Symmetry: none
Amino acid sequence: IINGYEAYTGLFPYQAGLDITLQDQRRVWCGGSLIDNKWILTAAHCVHDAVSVVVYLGSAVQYEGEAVVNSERIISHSMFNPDTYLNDVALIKIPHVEYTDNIQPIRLPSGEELNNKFENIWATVSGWGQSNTDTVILQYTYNLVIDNDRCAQEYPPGIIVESTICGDTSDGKSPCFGDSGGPFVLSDKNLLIGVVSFVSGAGCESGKPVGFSRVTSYMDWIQQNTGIKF
Amino acid sequence: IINGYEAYTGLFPYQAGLDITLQDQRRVWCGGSLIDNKWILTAAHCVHDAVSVVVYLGSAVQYEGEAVVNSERIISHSMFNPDTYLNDVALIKIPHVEYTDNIQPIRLPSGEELNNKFENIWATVSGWGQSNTDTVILQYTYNLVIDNDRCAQEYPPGIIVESTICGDTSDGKSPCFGDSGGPFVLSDKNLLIGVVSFVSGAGCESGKPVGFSRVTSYMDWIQQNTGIKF
Amino acid sequence: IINGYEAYTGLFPYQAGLDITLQDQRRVWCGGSLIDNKWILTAAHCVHDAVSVVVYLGSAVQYEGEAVVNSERIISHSMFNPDTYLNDVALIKIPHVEYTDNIQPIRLPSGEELNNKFENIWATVSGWGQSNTDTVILQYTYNLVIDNDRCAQEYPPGIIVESTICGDTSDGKSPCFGDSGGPFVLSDKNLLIGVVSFVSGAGCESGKPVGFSRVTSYMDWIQQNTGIKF
Amino acid sequence: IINGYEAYTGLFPYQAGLDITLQDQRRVWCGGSLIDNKWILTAAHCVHDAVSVVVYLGSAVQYEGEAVVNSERIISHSMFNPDTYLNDVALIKIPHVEYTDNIQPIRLPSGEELNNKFENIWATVSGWGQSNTDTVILQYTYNLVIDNDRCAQEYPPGIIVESTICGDTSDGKSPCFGDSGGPFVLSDKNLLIGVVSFVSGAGCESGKPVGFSRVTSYMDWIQQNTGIKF
């Protein structure tokens, strides 16, 4: 997160830290959201070629956690398109983790929330991605959700689709590399509305909107693959 | 590095820490070696699909450095084979950095050294890869160089080639994920003999040898691409 | 607030901005908390000698508000002691303001919360007081609540009493001049636990605890003077 | 300033903005005049109980300056009477500031000017006091200097004395709360004749005269305390 603020342990109890080992032996970092005792929701671009994932929960300090578990299964969206970031969502199954004061799930949309586009709403994004600073502490910032029409003109045709939700970064506060898969949340409602998916080709300090996977568009996929009815 | 020793600033002044941003926006970590004021030698598997790299020099703390520089250009071996790790070498051109107590280049082999296979010599490998400990301090260990024949027996046929140099990890001391691109050095000679290339399919704690790109095999390529004679 | 972060309009809907004119004609700024449609809770040191107060509500921008009203009456605690800051609480009666999306009351303690000391809890403090920066935007930070025994040793004898609640500023984030009267809140419970009362004689960047009026100790006074049963 | 004109940087290069921290920890704003590279002349009612002051010079924007300096010492008139505003003058010693296009000293009266009462001359008053507009830009207006006799008739007996100089505000243009300590200057002569001292009990919009400390009456005190001869 560029120009973010430091979180303390317990502030974002649903935040997951993912230490990912790829098929090519590289080590990648991504964020994720705890949506159930046994499930983490993240971005497909983070784990589509992952071999294993160490999941950190319950701490603002990177590579630390009140619970540190290994992924049991990775379910990357089958129609994920690497070129357009279309369908950039994935589920990581983990051993049952008991909720505590620092480990709590984030709520997923249901009912009417499924038809809400959340335009012009301030949401909170958090992660351990690149920042102007040198810190291992979880950072966060607020981004205003903009309408898809305005967002679509900031990217090449075809990138911004119905299943995309964008956050404005015109104030210089923005998710950056390493924040991928992280939660975009309506704090008031403890509701997950997006998953950090992509930053503009212009970079994190371009003032361009950041793209997120619109959670309401993937609720069927989530329920079907987790078997959980949210 | 699993079961390694803890380094400190100034101990390995040729060690580069690479914070890599990939074309797919993922953030990757790799090590490298300072071979000239403007050049870093690392593994092709680390940066073949990278768009930019932040280079940390002169500090044993991960993501810290006496000199923090951005890559100006990345030259990855055009004949690199992702499947076999053949020709796993790359160069990162950086803006001229002045050598200090904590920032020094490592010697590259020349003349007769170019014909040495370095069999049965203890070499030092260093990096910030997985260590089974949550530390941000650079680790290192000594691995014995074994002959390619003995090493080939431990890998699928065709993986270990003349341009591969292996380090034995039977002591249980071994480079691991995240150490990729790191230096394999003959300490007493201050000579670079290998670049961390691949771990065994069995993992880091299997006592299997680790493969490195044999530097003597790429000295022509390095000189061709850097325009520097050694 | 020193080393705080910027709030957006609607983030802290209970925050009040007070533009105070004193008996000596000086113009002072203090924060306050909206506790009812007709009442603002602030510090006695801010208004004990005030002639009039302009109350700003509903905006993160200083001197701006969705509702801007004038005080009708000021009720400063009769036993306020200027020398020790004992009983540093005051009520400002204002014309009925209707709650909106950006103007909401903060909840006051009741029942069991009245016996809770809130030790080792992270609370949020906000205001437009002195900051390292040049900004008219409301800032906030988090301070850990410490026990009174630890706090008492950081000040001359007699300053820290039962009715005082302290926040730790050892991380360099702290309320500063102009933040006086502002809210110290348990965000999770939307609960007001303290009113910014005093900074150490050593200043805002001393790392010394900041004293707040412990709201639970003044609930009777509040209910009796507002006539409202919380 | 009520009903004044908007200034801009460089227009009143002698204007000082004072962010004052009081002994009671309250934050107060007052204006002042740069009379020397190391001295600011202001009102005693502003700083008699102050512990420190941040001095803003060279900018028309409140809390901004080409030079932002901290007070080194504050000398308030020892015979200042809070009840009558008698001897309402103070000096703030600051670290030597170099004059620029936007930072220049104002002339102080000497010789014959010391005997001039300046009756019936238009003087310019400036400040960031209350303006019935939410602006952060310095305002100014012209007020006619009236004779003390005419002025005394508008105030309770004994308030207007020989060391008081009054400005008529019958046009509805008047200094107001927050303008305290500001300069009252004969523009064409670049001469300081008064320091904003007090507004009428009737308020700023009553057309009553505003009292200023008559600078010619304090020239001896200023020289005594600054060790500078004018």
